[model samples]
Target chain A: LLYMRFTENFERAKKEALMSLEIALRKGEVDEDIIPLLKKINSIENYFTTSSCSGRISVMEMPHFGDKAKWLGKWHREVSLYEVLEAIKKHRSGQLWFLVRSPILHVGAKTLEDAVKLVNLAVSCGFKYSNIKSISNKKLIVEIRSTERMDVLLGENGEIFVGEEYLNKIVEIANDQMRRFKEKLKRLESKINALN
Target chain B: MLLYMRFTENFERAKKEALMSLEIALRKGEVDEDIIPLLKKINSIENYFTTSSCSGRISVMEMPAKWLGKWHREVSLYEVLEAIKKHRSGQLWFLVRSPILHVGAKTLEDAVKLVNLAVSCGFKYSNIKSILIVEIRSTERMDVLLGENGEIFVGEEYLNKIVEIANDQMRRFKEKLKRLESKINALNR
Candidate 1:
């Protein structure tokens, strides 16, 4: 009886996820860099991606820690200093920040064993923060993440903190991180078939 | 039966080693005071013992991950400015990190229960990291770029604001630790 419930739950979850993914694809809402990887995972019999981000760099303005952030600019690839400076000009109030986040993907596995296998593979591919994020009778989630992140304070209350020279240096570092994580994504995509 | 025996053996050995290490760290004054009570409480429990822990910190660092300065408690604007002055070259950063605790559980059930309890207490990043080890952490963090090549980018006003923000995060994470400490005894039930 338990086995039947587990199987039925996984099947139903997978169907719902596929339908949502199809709708998202039609809306062109998926990050272009991660589409191939998502497709590969979904094609696997025991795995499917429920949500993902291909990693990004952005300029954000917010009043406090828990408050909603207003994005001045955002990019999935390496950004030029000119682009960043232009975004900085748009910051009016609140604290301004330049941020880089690593790629995060939540993959649903058919079983606890399958989830652990994918988590191990993801860590080997440099998504070192990988883990089984949650577990239940309905689903098992493997959160594939990396350690690449940056949160540089730019200014606050309509003022700029860093000079142009410092901004240029941060842009270089952010781009380097972008390149590094993009390579990890490619590596994970290539080795994803090993799970079979 | 064999696997269960192996697990029990490993856990017993790990707990013994951890207790010894904790005693040494306490004697050497290495463990943060704020987290000591929490650690003591967890170790007293039969099913769980912490392997390592950080009570959270705010820090100034240089490129390639070298610490220029770090504070485990709330910091002042003057303190942060002094740390930035020590930055000689390369990229300098001001970072605020949440507390992290690595715990060993006697069983998978214990590990999962600990993870669940931690998550409910706002340690949202809690996870069963390995066979019977759980990692408890929160998402509160700040990673601000301070300077590069000996050039400080922030003025006093902006520096003051950043200090306030980092301290705010410090208070937030400390509260989470307190919540976890207060509720951790529920595991005994």
Candidate 2:
């Protein structure tokens, strides 16, 4: 009874989440590459995703982490080494870095059991950073993620550090991390259908 | 209910234990000095105790490609520069991590208050990441690739810049901690 009380509005929340996903998909708001996986995640009876990024490689400059407004360059995509070189060239000041972020997916579950089930599935699928991100009166949220990340510094105050070879190697590594996490996403998509 | 009273009582013992652990860490010089006053302030609260914290930092590091090798720490700028000097193999990196603090709260409401306090104080990544754990943090990170395949070089100016910015972060978070300490009593109400 207690468990059921926590998920009393599960069906309602899932439906609402799916409806929004549908709208976003229709408007081309969702990343084209990740929509199919999102659909599979949404199709599951026990859970529905609220937000996701397929993971990314980025060229960024910032005064600090929490201060995004000062971001000099924030580009997320499968970037070429030369492209990233050009992006870094645009940095007028502040700290510069190249980064690879693993895919992130936030899901709402129908029950605590459902949340835990997905959390375990994700971890087993190599999303080792996956965890129950939050529990609130309105939602039980799980964050699915992986450890495939890169955080490398590039330069600062318009002074370039490291040479072109460094950028070449890191951009390649970033691309590799992107592919690896994407494969994990695919595995997650295939396995998530078993959640029910 | 009785649970609330039990919560208060639980924190009394937990606080003492936390302080003991912190003392050991401090004695060993493991504590990041910038956050000491913040830790002290939080420890002063009846319903809160800090478990661990880093004010924020930037560093030079080296490991095999894809991080498949052991990564070592470089303490001083000279050490970092010297480390970068011999970058004939492996991945050379410069990294910055935002300040992180894990605080234990006596009640859920207390945790929520501390989280908001951290966010307001510039720990933008602050959150109650899980039950009863208030993660006072920020999303600030800068990862620079210094080299790959064999050689690496990032200008010393860049290293100096990161160090300078890291110091600024430490200073800002110290102020935030003080501000939070001044207002944390509201949770008692």
Candidate 3:
């Protein structure tokens, strides 16, 4: 039980904080402080988990895993909040997630516009490529793969040519891409949204 | 960062354990008797980890990883360990392993061995000319094709069949591994 605590339960706490923030936002009450605090905590946890986690690609949404943001696809892999409490859920000891988070963190974002921007760059830069075309994981028919060095990343030490600084750039690109992606989704749904 | 363990040291473990055991026996003045027992213990662990595995009450060898162990041909390192450890001790949860971005654990070892095994009762996979046509994260391993596609020496469905037979065969494989493990654990006799 103690071992499981170090490996995964912390992520659970992060998720709770994130979800509360999200639910708060939906109810029109998200405080600005929450975002900065969440980001800072997530960044540090992400670094440690990634560094220790056999270089496994991990979640990017948040580090704590509990404080998920609703608009951010706050709940990803280990979705059942209760399973985490029981310590039987999947997750490794002290693993960081942003590496695994890749651009997929943008999938359920409030807007697909940002995801699309990152997707475009990833496709061009060769960090990822689409297998098929779909929006939702359950609906998306596409598969994504890494080109060039994404393969090297396959081995998991996480430093790119510009040093680990490239990871920050990559995450930035992915986030911006998601904003653009959401815009495109809105345009596609223009006919139905015409009522607005 | 490779995060992988290679069995390149099997020969080392074999040599060390046997030589040490023999030396201890010689010191005890039971060289003749201990030699046979030590040699048997050494052979069982080697064979148990490296041979076709079995399941059920027959052996301790686990099911083995997706592909390791078949005569010296090799198909399921993952499975043999599973069969052996579980049989010897009760379970080994930490044994499960995976590569980064490897979302699924659906094993490829089962189908691989049956096609290889069908060659003969004692036949190991390397006994044949078959080569793995694809290597990807999933059984659908279409990724092996890259953007295009490639020929399959073993069709997907056939691969599935190989997996099915590998399943039945592996049950026996695990059983045998378990049996060998128990033999080693009982080395006092």
**Best candidate (score: TM-score):** 1
Positional deviation of residue A3's Cα in model 1 after best superposition, in angstroms:
10
lDDT of 1 by residue, B21-97 (tens): 99999999999988898899999899888877889899999984678889999998888888888998887888888
Off by over 4 Å in 1: A1-8, A66-68, B1-9
Residue-level lDDT tens digits of model 2 in B32-111? 77678778878877778888677666665666633322211213556567756756666677666666788887865576
DockQ of each: 0.49, 0.25, 0.02
Let me know the DockQ for model 1: 0.49
lDDT of 2 by residue, A59-171 (tens): 67776543542443444456676677777778777767666787888999877567767878888898986765665556777888786677666766787776777667777
Error of 1 at B96 (Å): 1.5
lDDT of 1 by residue, A61-155 (tens): 99886455899999998999889989999999998989999999999998766777888899899988999777666777789999878887887
- Indicate the fraction of true inter-chain contacts that candidate 1 also forms: 0.56
Query: Recovered native contacts in candidate 3, as a fraction?
Result: 0.00
Whichever of 2 and 3 has more DockQ, that candidate is 2
The runs of at least 3 residues in candidate 3 whose Cα sits more than 4 Å from the true structure, single-residue gaps closed, are A1-163, A193-196, B1-189
In order, the Cα lDDT scores of the candidates are 0.84, 0.69, 0.27
Candidate 1 TM-score over all chains jointly: 0.90
Error of 3 at B118 (Å): 27
Docking class of 2: acceptable
How does each model score on TM-score?
A: 0.90, 0.76, 0.18
RMSD of each: 2.8, 5.1, 24.1
